[model samples]
Target: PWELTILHTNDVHSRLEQTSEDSSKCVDASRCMGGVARLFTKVQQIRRAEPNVLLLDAGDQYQGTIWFTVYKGAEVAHFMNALRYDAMALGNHEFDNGVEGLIEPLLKEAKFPILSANIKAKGPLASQISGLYLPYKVLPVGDEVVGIVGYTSKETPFLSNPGTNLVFEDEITALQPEVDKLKTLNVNKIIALGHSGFEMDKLIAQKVRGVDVVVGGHSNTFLYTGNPPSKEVPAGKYPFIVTSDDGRKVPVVQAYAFGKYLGYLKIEFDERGNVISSHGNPILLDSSIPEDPSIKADINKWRIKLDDYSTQELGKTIVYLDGSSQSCRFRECNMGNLICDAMINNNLRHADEMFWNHVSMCILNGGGIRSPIDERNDGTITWENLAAVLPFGGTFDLVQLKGSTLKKAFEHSVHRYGQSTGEFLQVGGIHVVYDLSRKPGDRVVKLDVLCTACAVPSYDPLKMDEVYKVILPNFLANGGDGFQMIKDELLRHDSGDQDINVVSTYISKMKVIYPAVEGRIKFS
Candidate 1:
């Protein structure tokens, strides 16, 4: 019999420092919580106490803050190398910059092996990503050969830019074969480390016969024992146990997004690899944990390079621009209004004089609004603030669609109503009233479109057959977040304007703007 401890994290999203208590802004490191330095401090202590320890990351070490905006995957590689992760799964955002971005910069620099049993590459990407990624890896932890199989979310093509060469297969189908292969090699202890969401993770645990443990990411799920630490809430009990079809017990675990918590699971395995007992909780990386000095120094060096753009003043805000996931994903938020309004404004400003202007409304996904624009003491906003808000660097697109198609898009946006998701729509030049009690596809009860052609701005009830012009992020125009109806439109134009630039320009022109929700999107 032997005892092994597994330490894990998921969906870090490049939050290299402890954020403010409210998690809106970066603050003084001493007072802040959950940076890599502090995370490593806890990891070091755990390693000292436990000889057989496997430290792993479930993925998404990209795209969320100023660090990622500046350094891209290079920064993620540098820090992960410093921390020494045993193995990592590929999150959708890792392909945000395309296949070359993941292969040349990140995979080449990483000291640890990157795993994804489901992803297969062809053409140029296959040659580049071959040696870097593997289906699974076997590590000698103590006397046992622990097989680690990884799977990325199959929804990668819809959510990120993986290019045509890379193919993503379903998680369960990809994972089962890998687990079976590991079993054939006499690897009795198999751990499925993956980037699928929590629901899929649970499904994998329940369906995959040989997988003993599943560590997951992508949903940013928080699983903990007892009361959750700090202000966060747990989605489920720690080590959520699922009984497989064959009646085997499979344990699943995940830490919340960012480096806020470190998930720790201790398992006592019998000689035959059957779990005798399992227990543990997520360790909150709060102020109590001291930052390692060397890591802190390296982080400071990166901070210096970011200061120039981060400090450049863009505009001012009279009130807080609420871009928090909880606010934007659920309802009409000030930041959502600001972003959608900016998209409309940008299109009007750049409209060709000879071309008949038909753009009437704009829609921005709430999930794309990454962070809140803090109302500083002087009410100042900076380029860094806007950068943080729209970290994905999505560009603007103008598309012409029938009102019926637009309504279908609205239905899709609110499909996951009551849940925090990136698909929720934030709008400008339009109004929508939805009933949550109704089925998802039938949610939007009332729709109105702004008459931009009028001398005085006015709105009329949306005519189902009437063609309307709408402005939105290129990501959505290309069918991101399930806006397939919009993507199907034949009349669409790339505006060649980045979302961040549009918002910055709009805020600058407004000088001192106070954006508020005026029931643009109403719920009954």
Candidate 2:
């Protein structure tokens, strides 16, 4: 059997260039990450050695930087098309622009098939893909057949409303039969393309049988770094491989998010196509290879179109905005603090003028804080730095959450505080401490609700019957951030407007010159 080399990337959150100059701490010693042009060169280098290399992306390609915001992901598809991707999976963030954004890019521009065993098409999604999305696909690899199956998490319902109406089934139930069908075809290698994070992959490896390899996305985990099991093992057991579906051995690998590293996996089978062994390693896309001129040219062309907005400085920073890595994944960091504080301090200006008495504490979804802030040695902030911090183009909104519902809002935020994907809350409000040792709904040990006026402390939650003024972004006001409790809250608004505009107005009021890392709500 010929040696097969597989190159894959997952959860690439639009990190086109190396992180800002000051972000040397988290960007690895080489300081190289995702750049389409550089990635092209790496692919060409691998192909030069052996022509049978397969390049794949695991999804989450859209919705981070100005590149996607400006062009709606078409430009990225063009670049990938040039790179010759064999197949790509559909990640959760693909719907960030809504179904309309995905249609044209997938139909007109994208040369590859976006595979997912889950995603059902309705609304704009149905109109765009024409209901082409389903469970899996079988591609011809040399003389044998290779099956690729895709799945999304059950949390999709809470992430986005209306946009994500398709059913996300349990992985084991939805995919096991599909694997059996593929095996019946005498498929040479069975590979799973999954958006379900690393931990799920561990369970899938344990229960599901006959799957040779699993490539994971969404929960941005690096293979051999950050916090994890301290013990070291041979090339296989530690990360690249776990137990197989039938209690045999199979490999599981994930490329860290934002295109920092390209994940490589090699599987060797016997003459009868039974898997004998598998291995994988991270490939750092470094500056050693020149960025492909063609892809660079395409990016520059888009740059010219965005020159007008790019030139304007949203705000300057004392440091470069570049703190996005696995190290900054959890807890309160400098960048997260700056963003939450910006929204809160900015909203305070019109609070009294708008006749809104006493603003309750502010809360933000952790997922909204897009990138990091980097500090230069000279201590200067650039407009680019500000854009980096607020890259998702998400606007802030103020919604009314009554006292009873306020507890639910806090509960939703606590659900994600310690978990990997749940680390999305960048909160600013009166300090309410909690103990994680207790179970959910009981974790909150001390509750101190304060009214905006007179700094009066209210021990009890506001009456559920009476409406209280709660300020959040538009997303949460209409029941975003998975807190359905807000949907039932009474909406008392003097001005019916979008939250992003309000947040921007607030930033201009106070010249937020630096990033602050104060612990707003602490937990042990």
Task: Note the residue pairs that clash in candidate 1.
Answer: none
Give me the candidate number with maximum lDDT. 1
> Model 1, range 347-395, lDDT digits (tens) per residue?
5643321122457588989899999977876889988788899887556
Per-candidate TM-score against the hidden true structure: 0.67, 0.61
The superposed Cα distance between candidate 1 and the true structure at residue 513, in angstroms, equals 17
lDDT of all the models against the reference? 0.82, 0.60
Supply every candidate's count of residue pairs whose N, Cα or C atoms clash at under 3 angstroms: 0, 23
lDDT of 2: 0.60
| 238 Cα displacement, candidate 2 (Å) | 6.4
Candidate 2, residues 166-186: lDDT per residue as tens digits? 666788777788888887877
